[PDB]
Amino acid sequence: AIEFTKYHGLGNDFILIDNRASKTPAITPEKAVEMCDRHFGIGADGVIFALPGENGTDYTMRIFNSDGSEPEMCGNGIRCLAAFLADLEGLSRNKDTYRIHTLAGVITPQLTPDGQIKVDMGLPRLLAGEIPTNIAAADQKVINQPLEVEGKTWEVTCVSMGNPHCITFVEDVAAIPLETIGPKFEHHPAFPQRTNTEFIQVVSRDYLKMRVWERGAGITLACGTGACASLVAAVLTGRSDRLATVELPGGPLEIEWSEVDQRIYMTGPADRVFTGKLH
Amino acid sequence: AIEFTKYHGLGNDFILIDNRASKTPAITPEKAVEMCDRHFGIGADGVIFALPGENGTDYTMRIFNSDGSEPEMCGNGIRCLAAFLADLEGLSRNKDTYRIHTLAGVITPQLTPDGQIKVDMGLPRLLAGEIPTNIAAADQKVINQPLEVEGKTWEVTCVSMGNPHCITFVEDVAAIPLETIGPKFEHHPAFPQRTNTEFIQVVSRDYLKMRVWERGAGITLACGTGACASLVAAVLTGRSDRLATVELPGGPLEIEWSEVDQRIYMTGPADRVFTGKLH
């Protein structure tokens, strides 16, 4: 009986549920796992709920990963939700931006004329206690620090966009055995709440190639918070400028670490695929 | 604008299309590839068309694999189609069986009282020219014959259920590196039209454990024609009786090589997942 719309942001694909009638999500995390199963269910990297606003915001976003866990933010998902909300509001829409309450704070997507969505993703969080990670003291940053993974020492930088990211820079990102090494990063003891893991090949100071092993979703074709965190990590390590394209398997995102307000802006597409109803 | 229903037969999942208005499938193979993409489309192992009957049959089935190629039959798909047709007919249904025209001939699913579907899959085809394969002369069977794959010699048996199967018996089917070796069987030069490949672990004379690398779909959770062919191969090589359970990743099928009429009967479930409409 559950009605939903399938979206994807650069192939990071989601089940969107109109949940404006109640602050109670329409499905449990356990049901979200079943729904995200690609063979037995609808198939998705997560379920996103369009919920009633909180504390002045226009709406609230909650997301369940395909493993049922609930992360704090999702950049590809926010872009899908902004498109979804525009469709729900229809001709009653009276603005090009939504203020969206998330576990990570207020996030503000903007529908731009060219069909893209540009998102104010907030300030990056750089202290180890904010990731969270035990690689460094809670009040210290985590920049080009060692992380031993199955005997081999990786150089990693940690950034939070509300959710945790662990970024490592590599010569050939296509050659990373992501299915094998990804889980070992995700569940590394250094990360008490697990982490998302991004492998970054720097092509130039304004062009990064990214692959990601996501917390709670595995190999995905794109991750907005992950691209934001990777750009921040590339600036912090002096490898890139603050404006860059992040090329993902599903396509590109435009990332800016603004020097005006020190916030991260992420611009990318959102595509409605189909509407459906569970049997 | 395309309306569809998602089904799966033991996790072998399909997009079902009501195509009763024309003998011409309403989507092209190229569109079917897009629709089967699990991130950018609906996500499926194939698209199945419910088409007008031919030559006194009740309906016709055509199926496109997720690579766009068109195979001659699909057992999990016929079960899903039988369920779909029963839903389309509703209270106008006046029988428990459909005669369905396929490229492989007439196939007759029966809706049983317990909710399963028992399918008359027809006679197994055992001659090399019927597979087709060049392992033996066209008028010879292919039983425990050699096939060199990347320098290792495998013992294989070939059976056609309208579509080609290459069956090999192994001690530990879970240990097969299916993602790697599968494509090497599928595209082996010995198979002019490619082949489906089944790895079979005999648990007992009435219980086979199967994993499959499918022509045009890769690793799937179940294959009905493949389970039929694997049972035939297990009989031909003296390893099993003619009545057996075939355990697949998605669950079990009951297979019978009838001594009454020498035809193969396949019994299994079919589950309706959701209905949808493409944007």
Ligand SMILES: C[C@@](N)(CCC[C@H](N)C(=O)O)C(=O)O
């Ligand atoms: C990939 C992601 N959807 C984030 C999903 C949440 C992530 N899997 C986590 O668990 O933190 C995004 O930012 O675009």
Ligand SMILES: C[C@@](N)(CCC[C@H](N)C(=O)O)C(=O)O
């Ligand atoms: C797996 C299959 N759907 C057959 C699909 C067709 C197969 N991929 C082929 O190309 O012959 C079945 O019999 O249940």
